[PDB]
Amino acid sequence: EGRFQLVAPYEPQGDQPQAIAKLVDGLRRGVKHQTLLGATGTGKTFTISNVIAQVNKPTLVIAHNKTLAGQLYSELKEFFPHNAVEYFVSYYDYYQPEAYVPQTDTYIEKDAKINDEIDKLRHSATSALFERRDVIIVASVSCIYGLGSPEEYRELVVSLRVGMEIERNALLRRLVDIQYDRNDIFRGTFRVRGDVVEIFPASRDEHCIRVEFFGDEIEREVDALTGKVLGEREHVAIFPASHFVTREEKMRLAIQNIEQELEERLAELRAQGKLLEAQRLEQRTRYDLEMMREMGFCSGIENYSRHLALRPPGSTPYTLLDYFPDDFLIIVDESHVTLPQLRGMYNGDRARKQVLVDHGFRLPSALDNRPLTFEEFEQKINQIIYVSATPGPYELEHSPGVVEQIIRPTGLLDPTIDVRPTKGQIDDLIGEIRERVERNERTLVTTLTKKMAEDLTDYLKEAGIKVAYLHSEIKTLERIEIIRDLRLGKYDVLVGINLLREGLDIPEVSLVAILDADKEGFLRSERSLIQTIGRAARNANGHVIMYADTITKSMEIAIQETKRRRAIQEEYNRKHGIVPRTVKKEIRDV
Template sequence: MSKQFSLAPDTFPPRGDQPTAIEGLVDGLSRGKRIQTLLGVTGSGKTFTVANVVARTNKNTLVISHNKTLAAQLYSEFKQFFPNNNVGYFVSFYDYYQPESYLPQTDTYIEKDTEVNEKIEKMRLEATAMLMSGEPTIIVSTVSCIYSLGSPHEWDQSAITLSENMEIGRKELIHKLIEARYERNDITLSSGSFRVKGDTIDIIPGYSDDVIRVSLFGDQIEQIGIHNSVTMAKKRTVGTVKIFPAKHYIIGDDAKNDAVTSIQRELETWLPNLPGELERQRLNSRTNYDLEMIQELGYCSGIENYSRHLDGRKPGQPPFCLLDFFGNDFLLVIDESHVTLPQLRGMYQGDYTRKKSLVDYGFRLPSAFDNRPLKFPEFEKYLKSTVFVSATPADYEKKNSSAIVEQLVRPTGLVDP
């Protein structure tokens, strides 16, 4: 992969109002303007303009769209514009999602029920791995990017770096893989799993289709090869490889012990506040069961509800999300901002309303409130180098933009698209 963003060589040169819009946005970003709006009519090639801005500024870029279909379309377009750079796709991985809830009017508890799309889960892991690689990266996302995701520092710390001639025993490597949430399966190898045959360990990262084959000689790595997962034909030999965890929620031993203590303390403090013995008994048994699972396995069902304790955050402190994987200096593009911004604004309140009855009736600890999407004021703190893209900017864009760059003449020169 290139260390610079480079547009595909067969890309058409900008036409119509595109050259002026590109220059205006790039100039604004270089002058430190926090928020600009690209006001472009339908069919004027706004995505192509954004691609040129990305290539000129050479910053990691997050593009937020308001639904999966448009996000997939943008992902496809950016892949064509930047064939030699990282382009990732980060949307909700649920094909079906029934959130945990409680209806006190009918005394009905609805357990969380989900159907996960494994391909999209892999693409989410791939997106964060791209950002951690240090190479120029574009991620296309939906509002999923403001939801709790786990600590980028913990995720990076839990990655396993292997290199040729490195001293590491077979048992130690297996232990590290299990800690990184990889599953051992010596029969069928799939994404996020590994198998062991003698001194050879085959691993398929949670974000890849290739097999990493680690050949050991005693307690030393003899060779690391990248293989095709179907034919097992060797593609190449590498000197060093970094294997990121198979899941986004990772707990180190120190963080796990601190989290267990913190959860127990919260449980003891909160139990007297519940209205009846039934609620107290329910919360006590559920929480203690989860604590046993965390201590024994490192995770439990619904572990995200304890994310505040696992991340070491204070009550009310915003969760880690995809935005935190970008660092401090990145370009944020909000597509169809007149629709996407209201969606970003409304996510928190819906989540809070559902969880309130779970907490009030002893199904969850109050810390579950902190497994949430960002509040809009928290999201606004990330608007440091931002371009809103819209044909019909709303009041928020008009009020907060340092510049509104117009793109009214289409590349074709036609009045209608």
């Protein structure tokens, strides 16, 4: 196939169209980097899907954390339910990276249970890229992680057609030769019928363990289930059950190589050191090899990825970006945060693994199993598009100007900003607060020190006001619980240090306080401030008060931009006759 079908209730509102089409044209004109500058709540996720469909290409949308990768998922689902949309994540978004604390001389094993759901979609994701051209995969920074080679996937593939002759025990083998999927057992798996005309209940294949069970009697091919039959076929494809699978003849040789190293490493470790003389690792190396020649896989296999692949030391790893057709597209959400973090992933891995090698719990060759370097990520790009309200210096210095999109569909507008002295700052912020309770409106405050927030909360309650918390990480459960508590009348105010903590996109909030605007901090930067400001644009009377003594260069930039931004949204509601009205949202249950 290969046709994108973009469903949707609305239509391009704001200045979406200018945006969309500008990007599009720019792909086509063959440009590498483009940056989308979209304000908060102006609808980026949607604008994006439009461009996607105009270029009919397959893409990976990299988000910077589990949750986000999630929202983007479902969202993009409602947009295209007739196309391929997968969710590539990993156990980096949870467990412990088998490390070692030397001082406390305390070891920590790779304790990570296989959470099947994950694996399920990891496999559907890979597969999809060799069948259709209409695929979409949302993923974490984790996509730049080492993975089995792709070619050795489009090779160990079981192409099933009609008219060809294969034993009833011949395919049963290429089948176990790929770490069998579900051809064993709560039964006999896929054993029945027999002869030249067999049965074979090829089930649990992860690439579609959503109960599909493919049956092929003397190819045959007819999608089934745990109940009854459905949907007809004449050509199927079965995929490996591991991303790190290898061919026997190759494994045989890898093993010898592993060995030459473990040997010749103890000789160099013998001479220089005496860290348990050198050895101690022999316990698991050898224990690992024995479990290897006996069975294709083993314990921490992944560690021997470079060796198994049969590629020279230092080699750059294989990644999900290598499974995408030669001309694909990558969307990077919240790019000013993602990018930087995905940058120092190699450094932190290398750091925590070199330790295990000095202490000797894995060998040099284990270093070769790592994430990409930022340059290795670069050399792999075909064409990208960065999305963010606060684009970083990288995107701007590589991109040819930006592509502005700053008009919300409701026609709401970035607040107005005030800046007042630190003297008498509290009795002032109380007065400007009482007045919001009298108009049924909520507030949000921010400090720098957890002892300044604390110093306030009480001061506030002692003023006769329903007030919020003072503790940063108050779980996530009770956390979502008190957000709900606010947009309801429970409280009128709310103090926090970090307000950029998602969930805080509330409409009943009309005023936002920034108590140490001119101080030093990450939470007081050109980018970070603008972002805190947008928390006051979910309303028709959004205002921001900045309490300070001086006007930092950061403060300046923010204010300057918000201004300009607001002007243009206003001259626009003019030409069109729109009166800004506050968004409404329902108030569910936790």
